[PDB]
Amino acid sequence: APNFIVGNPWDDKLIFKLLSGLSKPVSSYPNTFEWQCKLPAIKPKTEFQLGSKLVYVHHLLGEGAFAQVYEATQKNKQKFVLKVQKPANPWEFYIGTQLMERLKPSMQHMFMKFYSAHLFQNGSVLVGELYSYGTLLNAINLYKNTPEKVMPQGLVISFAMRMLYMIEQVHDCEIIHGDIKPDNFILGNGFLEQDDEDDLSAGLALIDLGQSIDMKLFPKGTIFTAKCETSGFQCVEMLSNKPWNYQIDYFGVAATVYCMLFGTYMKVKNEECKPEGLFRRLPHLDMWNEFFHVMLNIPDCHHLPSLDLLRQKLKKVFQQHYTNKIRALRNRLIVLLLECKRS
Ligand SMILES: COc1cnccc1Nc1nc(-c2nn(Cc3c(F)cc(OCCO)cc3F)c3ccccc23)ncc1OC
Ligand SMILES: [Mg+2]
Numbered sequence: 001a002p003n004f005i006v007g008n009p010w011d012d013k014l015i016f017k018l019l020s021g022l023s024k025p026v027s028s029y030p031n032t033f034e035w036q037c038k039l040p041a042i043k044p045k046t047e048f049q050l051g052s053k054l055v056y057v058h059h060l061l062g063e064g065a066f067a068q069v070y071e072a073t074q075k076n077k078q079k080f081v082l083k084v085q086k087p088a089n090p091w092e093f094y095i096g097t098q099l100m101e102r103l104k105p106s107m108q109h110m111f112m113k114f115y116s117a118h119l120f121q122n123g124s125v126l127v128g129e130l131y132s133y134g135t136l137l138n139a140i141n142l143y144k145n146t147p148e149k150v151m152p153q154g155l156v157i158s159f160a161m162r163m164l165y166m167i168e169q170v171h172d173c174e175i176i177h178g179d180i181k182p183d184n185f186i187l188g189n190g191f192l193e194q195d196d197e198d199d200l201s202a203g204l205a206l207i208d209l210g211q212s213i214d215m216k217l218f219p220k221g222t223i224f225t226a227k228c229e230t231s232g233f234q235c236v237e238m239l240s241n242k243p244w245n246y247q248i249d250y251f252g253v254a255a256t257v258y259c260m261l262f263g264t265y266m267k268v269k270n271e272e273c274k275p276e277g278l279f280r281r282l283p284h285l286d287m288w289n290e291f292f293h294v295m296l297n298i299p300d301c302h303h304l305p306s307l308d309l310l311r312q313k314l315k316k317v318f319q320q321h322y323t324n325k326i327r328a329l330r331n332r333l334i335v336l337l338l339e340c341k342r343s
Helices: 012-020 090-102 105-110 136-143 153-172 189-193 247-262 285-296 307-321 326-341
Strands: 004-006 032-034 047-050 053-064 067-073 079-085 114-119 124-128 185-187 204-206 222-224 268-270 273-275
Touching: 012 090, 053 079, 090 114, 090 124, 105 153, 136 185, 136 247, 136 326, 153 204, 153 247, 153 307, 153 326, 189 326, 247 285, 273 285, 285 307
Parallel strands: 004 222, 032 114
Antiparallel strands: 047 053, 053 067, 067 079, 079 124, 114 124, 185 204, 268 273
């Protein structure tokens, strides 16, 4: 069991050392393309050339740190997404490739498809599948201008269950996402198309692998100690100067669910670690207390709570209360989401 400390799994030197040590380098992947020129100008409402093809850039979907994310089109025209990094970030493509190799085939539908990496001298462009109904953060914010004010519980629970099941699979692959939050969840046609009454909402994917960690590249028992990057929320361990590995994602899923529940960011306090708010008036109060308690009070790296059990507890409540409500709750969000995309 002995702890092998890696202080900072995001350190640029370390990422360089790890990607250099690979037997199958990212450049050798079949869908990686290296170009001996600089990154073309990529801006809204203009074309640019990507290797052989010509790509029209529609609008900016997000930007942050070294990355900009764009919607784009290539006789019938397929829409897609570009993630442009300056300087080059092969790390994301590395993680995304490993994830897809490791995931059980039956789970791959829960993840955004990717198509190619183009490595230029001063940057990279990754090409991905478009989820055209925006982020979960945007969705939560859409509820703020309704009389409802927040997402309804039935949908909150459907989404929370999908997240737990999703991260269960990611962790089974020995990957840590590292930056789980509402603005890293995206909503796609799978959600629009969802006609059935299944407990898990389709069309939800988790993207942005900028803080992702491959535990297969480190020794058994590896733990980390650093606090998070500029855009991240500090997890419980970082907040009390303790080591972490998979706990960071438990915390992220909790913060994300919290944000669905209250429409604002999670702040925590100690008594046991607990989120602020969480008033007596909340529906399913006992379920939520138990949820947040288990997600936020992980004794150590050897006592990671069962994501399956966490989900089974939510599922019991969902099955009791929401099986006959969920279709109408989803349809109502569809109506808000399609209105938002009209502007
Ligand atoms: C409303 O926003 C979106 C709608 N549809 C698709 C993507 C959206 N947005 C965002 N995409 C990404 C992103 N990350 N990555 C890296 C990535 C990945 F997330 C998964 C990968 O595959 C694992 C299985 O999905 C591979 C990757 F290279 C990508 C690659 C290719 C293209 C995009 C990404 N990062 C931030 C984003 O917004 C803040
Ligand atoms: Mg991030």
